[model samples]
Target: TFRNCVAVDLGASSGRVMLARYERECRSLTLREIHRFNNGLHSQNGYVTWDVDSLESAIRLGLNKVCAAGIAIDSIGIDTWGVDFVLLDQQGQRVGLPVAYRDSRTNGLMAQAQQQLGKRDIYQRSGIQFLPFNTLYQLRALTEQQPELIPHIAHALLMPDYFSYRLTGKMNWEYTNATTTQLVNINSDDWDESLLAWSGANKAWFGRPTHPGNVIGHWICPQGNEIPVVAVASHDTASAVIASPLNGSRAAYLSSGTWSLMGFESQTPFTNDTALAANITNEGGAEGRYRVLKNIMGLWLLQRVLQERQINDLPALIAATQALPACRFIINPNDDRFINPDEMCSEIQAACREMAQPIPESDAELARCIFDSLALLYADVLHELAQLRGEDFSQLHIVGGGCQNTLLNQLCADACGIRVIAGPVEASTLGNIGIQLMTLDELNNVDDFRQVVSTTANLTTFTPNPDSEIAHYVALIHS
Candidate 1:
């Protein structure tokens, strides 16, 4: 029933501020991207951090354009990458550039935490995947390295929260992003004090996490105009999962982009030893659920290689990758050594050599290797989901720019042997719209939003055949 709404979906490589048209009478939702910008980690003075001020300007520029378009805007929501946060002094000025998650400063902090607190105890309390760069590890790395800045700190705000604070001057920890910190207790719905004590960090800085769809505050535009800012599923993957148009519980999503977060939704965290050893994550969900998943190294591998090669022919590269031989080489995306490697193509080759596999020497070969590894990782995590949850995943969804690679999608279906659905290609936008729709009282519930999404979304389905051989490739991979 709403005429128009804006959704700001921020990704690791890029961010888009879009307008969504939802007409209840026709049951249609149309998305148009108004403003777009590139996003990534920037290194300055020997530390990696996000250009938060630039990002804030981008958001403002987008909002300003929307106002210029002369369309009535109902509400706005934002979703972005999670885990890293910005610190502020008592006056609320950002202490320093917020460190990017992949910055090497967090390299050995996880081991330090485990040495002091033990891994199992930390896992039991937080139930989050053990990314060396998770907020817990990041905090540990900071306090040990910069003790002087800790005392002057007034509060800490995650990426999305920082943007919202900049817009509205209110501080609220969003639920979906909070869970990514690996510090929030699933049972408590807040920071786990024991976890904080073990990491040797202050807990007083965290605000009570607010549920998605709640209005955190309002912002006055540069022209003295006012607009409401609703906190959506603040985590980008969380938003993608919320935007997913699933027919049943048999579905999972690969929020594929800079990082491929593959997982299914559940009501509780999975913290058993087997699950922990598998390194599955338990990020928060939008609708009072849990995102039990695994974070796989995604397209960053290709991005890095492309940059090094000075190759800007992305479409040509995708085509070249499609023409390459199948299974030329494989890399385990979960390998820690690959997380922030100084050289991506070298790491791919090193992984091959370590596994006693043939090295991919050419660009196409390297691209093929990356896709094969990712799809195989998908199969691995999907199986893990079933093993832990006790049900075969009936459907798989790939949502993001990476889904546009038909070669990868088909390979994924062949590798996973599950019926696959990839599309809407703009999931973050849809998710941003869904949250704003609910905030404006246009959609009463998530199910209602899903009904609208199912109709508006353009999807491509891949059916598994008898010769798909997902099991065969998986066995080869494990062997």
Candidate 2:
């Protein structure tokens, strides 16, 4: 017997609908991309918003294609980046456009919230890091900046749940994504009453969240088929963690992308004073584990640089950047200003300027700065992560699309001083399918899925390289 499932995974740059087939006879897994589309921010109605209609349209086209193939589909799942949510009225009609997290509307609202609620108190409630654009601050922005739309807001569906709702007409929140809201109480694993009240959002807007294995409902296809819709670890990063193929806390994972989320898995939350000062996050993961991590500005810097320069030759860019010296143009990649800058290239240069570092002029120089700084940060955070758990990592797993960037991958290995394995590039999609397979009774648990993935997927390993001394000095200078 075999199983066929569809995974609709959305990220900052693109959205993909992938069909995965698992043949039990061969004990194998294979994936085929059914549809792909570009996704980015659009300036609409005086705010940076996501075009949800376009996403829904593209998703339907992908789903229809899978249905047309008629391979006796098992189920469908969806995953997306977190913190952005869609509000609906009593009729389940959208009340307003979904604003992108990078929008400036949430500026100053962060400090204002801290002023009212002590920063320590907020961090103690939710083991989440204080990112400026978290759902808590976003809701506060909605309440203060656009109060007119509040009364009609009857339901708040997070990014992936919105798509699941569109498919199944059922409303439910998944656990992994809920932790990103920074509204969920760390101990309770449910919405915090105080944070909810402070955000000015109605308590009735959210329901109790369910974990990954639960099936939301079934989607009735036009061809007279009813496909079950599973509430996977709906957060893209959460799904990626599932297929990271890590054996224990001794192995760390970096879901490399726009944000380099580097961290280890833990059974306990690290909400200590040191961790709070470092602003580390303890997001919920599959099987009730904690996804302890820090959000370092990743390839987003290089990505925007290439966009502005209108340079399409990526291989040339990487090669040129590789030729430059390391740590010469280093800047703190996690600085708030770099979060969503108007001019990414200049913003990086400006940060360098403020740091009394030489300005990077050439495109290659700018790319080098990002690579060196990100690797340095990775090294720095990996140490902190090890300290928190009282265990050192022997290896690091890098996943997602950017894992193929071999240049950065080796830099990561050299800087972190650990064996680095990069692979299963479509980790979120694969994790999404893994969860679906469990629901279909094809796999017993997470470990079973990971074993299957490890046996089938292609992987590249990097042992620590030489010349990591510059990274040590650079990290010290930044510190």
Candidate 3:
């Protein structure tokens, strides 16, 4: 028997509707990208916001394509990046444009809140990372900038939740995504009343968040075919982690994409001074698990550089980068100024200048700088994470689109001195489908899902050399 489903996996820059097929007899999974479209922040009236109407239409258009193909999907699920959300009025109409997370509107909100609410108090309550664009700060920004919109708000749905609502006309705040908001109490797994009160949002605005693998409602297609809408891990990174195919406790995962989310699964959230100082987040995962990870600014630097230079061939650029001298320049990838900068290349150059390091003059030089910097950051995170766990991780699993960068994978292995496995580039879509199948009792658990994924995923391995030149490069960065 073949069970089919659709996963609307949304990214920061693009969105895709993936069709997944699972063969029950062989326990194999397959994915077909049915539709993919560009999705980026739009400048609306001098304010950067998501074009929700356009996104809705794109999603519906993708669904209609599936219907036209006569593929009878068993269920559908949507997963997206965390924090950004949409507000609806009494009639379920959006109160205003959904703001993009990268917008500069939340510049100093986190600092302002820290002053009023004490950093330790907020961290102890939420256990989320101190990101400037977290939903708590975003909501506070809304309250201060557009306080009038608060009174008419009937419901506040995160991006994926809003998409689910559009599909089935039902509302549900899925748990995995809710934990990213810096509003959910880590101890209780629910919205913190104090934070909610501070944000000017009423208790009624958000219903209880449902865990992953629940049936939310049914989607009625234009062709009159009804399909169940299952609430999978609605957070894109959470779904990616679900498909990481981790086998043991010592295995750490890097959900490598626009942002490199590196962590391991934990049953309990980590909330201590060390965790707070590390800026590590305990994002929610499947089956009440916690993804104790740190967010690194990932391939966005290279992506922006390529986009600005109008270079279409990535492999060529990677080859050029590889040919260049390694580790000539390095900069902290997580510097706050890099977030949504007006020009990325200029920012990188400016950072190098400010750091009293050699500036990258050519595209190849810039690419090498990014790769070296990110690899160093990965090493730093691995060191900190091992200290927190009181054990060193032997394996690093790189999943998601950014895992395709073999150069970075090798660099990561060398810099971190850990065995690296990279593969199953469509991790989010597979995880979305895995959860849907698990909800239907077609799979046993995450272990079973990983077993199934392992059989199908084309994985690559990278091993570190003890006496490699990478050590010299790493020492230079530290120097």
Off by over 4 Å in 1: 465-472, 475-479
For 1-479, candidate 3 gives per-residue lDDT tens digits of: 68888999999888999898887788778899888998887889867998888788888888888888888888999999999999999899998778988888888999988898889989999999999999999898888899878789999999998999998889999999999999999988889998887776777999887799888888977778789999999999999999998978899999998899999889988899999999999999999889999999989888888888888899999988888777768889999988888899999999999988999978899899999899989999998888997878989999998899989998899999899999889899899999999887788888789988888899999998556566666766577
- Pick out the ten consecutive residues of candidate 3 with the lowest summed lDDT: 465-474
- Least well predicted 10-residue stretch by lDDT in candidate 2: 466-475
lDDT of 2 by residue, 155-273 (tens): 99999999999888999899999999999999999899999999999879999878888899888767777899999999999999999988776899999877788998888999999
Best-fitting candidate, scored by TM-score: 3
Q: List the residue pairs that clash in candidate 1.
A: none
- What residue runs in model 3 are displaced by over 4 Å at the alpha carbon? 475-479
Per-residue lDDT, model 2, residue 170, is 93
Give TM per candidate.
0.96, 0.97, 0.98
Model 1 lDDT, full chain set: 0.83
Candidate RMSDs in Å, in order, are 1.7, 1.6, 1.2
Task: Please state the error at residue 409 of candidate 3 in Å.
Answer: 0.5
lDDT of 1 by residue, 136-165 (tens): 888877887887888888899988888888
